[PDB]
């Protein structure tokens, strides 16, 4: 695994791509989290010349610089250790490889869907060499209440307020799904003291960072008292959670549900929307993984419908024993 902590209330990021709505949403979050400063220091967009773009910090119009060249952005903003890459699928590989020539960058979010698996494996190899955490590809990103929001994750202020995402609770989560991560923000905010950190690892076969990568971070973060994993048919990643519990590495309560139980009832193989969501062996089905997780001592609901109930029960037990 890599760094335990990716983001803080001091995180500064460069955004690759002309994504003014996503940047303004980050700034709206930063403002209600009472951050001192915007989380976006600069944008990189090679299709325009250097210029400044207007944004709002509360009622106040502010300027964020947009650079044609990544080297100028990095040089002028040594405080940045995160890049959020909204490049199209055609150039996401090259621009992510380029980003990793800058030692300042310790975390990269890769948004685009459709990057070939063999290219993502090369990104993973370079990131592993350098200790860079990749979130994505094919993700909305993630959110750390009070601290930092990746791009569009968590939406606009009405949803940030509704789901209490302006201050951290005690519950960390990881999911493949971007949409469902924001559903988890909602569920967790209604059943517990709220999200501490959430990550959407994306839909691809080889995620730049895995479920276990983030579960281990959460195990090692004192503010996290329980962990929720929304798993998925395809691959064998969730068995690593079983192994980590068996080994005594994972001691905080883990709630997990793997989606895709319907595939067991279909007569033919079905590729679901996420590129990685296709079971190439019996062990990769959601039914198989849910059973293994339950047998290893994970809290597994009967179905997605009972996920909220089980989260609330684990949470209340942890309050009762003084952990929360």
């Amino acid at each position: 695994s890599k760094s335990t902590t990716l983001f803080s209330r001091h995180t500064k990021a460069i955004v690759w791509g002309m994504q003014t709505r996503a940047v303004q949403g980050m700034l709206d979050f930063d403002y209600v989290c009472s951050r001192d400063e915007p989380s976006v220091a600069a944008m990189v967009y090679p299709f325009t010349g250097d210029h400044k773009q207007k944004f709002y910090w509360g009622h106040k119009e502010i300027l964020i610089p947009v650079f044609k060249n990544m080297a100028d952005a990095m040089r002028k903003h040594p405080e940045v250790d995160v890049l959020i890459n909204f490049a199209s699928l055609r150039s996401a590989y090259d621009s992510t490889m380029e980003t990793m020539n800058y030692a300042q960058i310790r975390t990269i979010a890769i948004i685009a869907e459709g990057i070939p698996e063999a290219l993502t494996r090369k990104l993973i190899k370079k990131a592993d060499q350098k200790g860079v955490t990749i979130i994505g590809p094919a993700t909305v990103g993630g959110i750390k209440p009070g601290c930092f929001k990746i791009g569009n994750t968590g939406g606009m202020l009405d949803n940030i307020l509704a789901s209490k995402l302006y201050r951290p609770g005690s519950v960390a989560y990881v999911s493949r799904s971007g949409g469902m991560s924001n559903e988890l923000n909602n569920i967790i905010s209604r059943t517990t003291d709220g999200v501490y950190e959430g990550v959407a690892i994306g839909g691809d076969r080889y995620p730049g960072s895995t479920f276990m990568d983030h579960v281990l971070r959460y195990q090692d973060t004192p503010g996290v008292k329980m962990i929720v994993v929304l798993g998925e048919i395809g691959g064998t990643e969730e068995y690593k959670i079983c192994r980590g519990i068996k080994e005594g590495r994972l001691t905080k309560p883990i709630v997990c549900w793997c989606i895709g139980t319907c595939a067991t009832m279909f007569s033919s193989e079905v590729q679901f929307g996420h590129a990685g969501a296709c079971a190439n062996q019996a062990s990769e089905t959601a039914v198989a993984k849910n059973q293994a997780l339950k047998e290893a001592g994970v809290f597994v609901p009967r179905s997605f419908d009972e996920l909220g109930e089980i989260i609330q029960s684990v949470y209340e037990d942890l309050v009762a024993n003084g952990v929360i």
């Binding site: 055609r90 999911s175 971007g178 989606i259 033919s268 079905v270 679901f272 929307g273």
Partner: protein, 420 residues
């Protein structure tokens, strides 16, 4: 996603593009047969069909063809025709998939000993590509992401148990095979068996998957490559239409038909939520009536969502069902998809299809949150009022999958929660 290709497609590419010192025999000596084949024209095009005995088998993404009794071996052309008579066009269940045997491949029979048969497979993992070799428990080697696979590497790590007089030709072929696998963005390539006789290398068998996202890289070499449906399903023009929309845009638009005659249709946002809704439907006994799997996401426009929805609505008004039909329009609380814009596209499609939807006794259930969802829910409620189609509309205060139990009659409809 990684997509299977037919044996014929894979061999066409292999024979065109592999580089090896090995003398690959019988290049392009295959002939495709379907229930529409005109045997005289087949023979006009492939006169080698008369020149030696033959092997015939399906080429329809069925595995274990030999163990299923689906390979006819060492037959004259008349013997192939006789072998096809009970099989061509026949129903077949394989495992639990059921379809029709409609695509076969004929190739020359190659006399050879069991000692002349080998197994080769290459497949992708996170850490690189594993190469398997067996003479006939297979030897296996991980080739790392940045590693080359030279013939000397294959001899050292994989051919320890291979006949001495065949190591050079095997190593050359396997090295060329691996380079071909990489250059054409394969993720899985199995040859079962590879035959090496005194006359050279024969590829008797092939199964493969390619990473279909690499079309923008590989299109010059792939050409108009075909990705067949899995055995047990058909391909539909509506699926191709949605796939073409998907290809044009950063937004995600996906559609797979499971049962065109089913009475349960979904139009759900998100790769995640769409699966959860499918799970819930199947948990409540609806698998045999679930017509489709699919999703839209990544902030499609009003027009994209219109073109998507009209496809569904057309599909669900092709023939009546005695109990009417259900449309589940669901989703998470979106992060950034514009729910007003997307739901206005759906509403426009509903208006264009209101007659057929009423004729087919469709009831619609809606649950959605996200940007501008309140206006999205309003226009859904309004189109129900103006068309007379029953539509039950829910927001963030309703559990995501609750509308499934409502739609299937397992729980009452809670009118106290409408629009919230």
């Amino acid at each position: 996603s990684a997509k299977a290709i037919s044996e014929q497609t894979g061999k066409e590419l292999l024979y065109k593009f592999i580089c090896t010192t090995s003398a690959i025999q019988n290049r392009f000596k295959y002939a495709r047969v379907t229930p529409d084949t005109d045997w005289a024209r087949l023979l006009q095009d492939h006169p080698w069909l008369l020149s030696q005995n033959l092997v015939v088998k399906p080429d329809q993404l069925i595995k274990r063809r030999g163990k299923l009794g689906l390979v006819g071996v060492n037959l004259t052309l008349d013997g192939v025709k006789s072998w096809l008579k009970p099989r061509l066009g026949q129903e077949a269940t394989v495992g639990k998939a059921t379809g029709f045997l409609k695509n076969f491949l004929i190739e020359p029979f190659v006399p050879h000993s069991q000692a002349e048969e080998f197994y080769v497979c290459i497949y992708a993992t996170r850490e690189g590509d594993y190469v398997l070799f067996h003479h006939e428990k297979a030897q296996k080697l991980l080739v790392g992401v940045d590693e080359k696979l030279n013939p000397e590497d294959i001899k050292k790590h994989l051919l320890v148990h291979a006949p001495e007089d065949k190591k050079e030709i095997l190593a050359s072929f396997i090295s060329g095979l691996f380079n071909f696998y990489e250059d054409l963005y394969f993720t899985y390539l199995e040859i079962n068996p590879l035959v090496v006789t005194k006359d050279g290398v024969y590829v008797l068998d092939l199964a493969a998957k390619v990473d279909a996202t690499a079309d923008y890289i590989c299109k010059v070499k792939w050409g108009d490559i075909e990705f067949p449906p899995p055995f047990g399903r058909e391909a539909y023009p509506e699926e191709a239409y949605i796939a073409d929309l998907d290809a044009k845009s950063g937004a995600s638009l996906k559609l797979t038909l499971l049962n065109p005659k089913g009475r349960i249709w979904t139009m759900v946002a998100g790769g995640g939520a769409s699966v959860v809704y499918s799970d819930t439907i199947c948990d409540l006994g609806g698998v045999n009536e679930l017509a489709n799997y699919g999703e839209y996401s990544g902030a499609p426009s009003e027009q994209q969502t219109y073109d998507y929805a009209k496809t569904i609505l057309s599909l669900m008004t092709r023939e009546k069902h005695p109990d009417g039909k259900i449309l589940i329009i669901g989703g998470s609380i979106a992060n950034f998809t514009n729910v007003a814009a997307t739901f206005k596209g759906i509403v426009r499609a509903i208006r264009d299809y209101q007659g057929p939807l009423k004729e087919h006794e469709v009831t619609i259930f809606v649950r959605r949150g996200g940007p501008n969802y309140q206006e999205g829910l309003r226009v859904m409620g309004e189109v129900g009022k103006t068309t007379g189609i029953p539509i039950h509309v829910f927001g963030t205060e309703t559990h995501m999958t609750a509308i499934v139990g409502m739609a299937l009659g397992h729980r009452p409809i809670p009118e106290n929660l409408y629009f919230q």
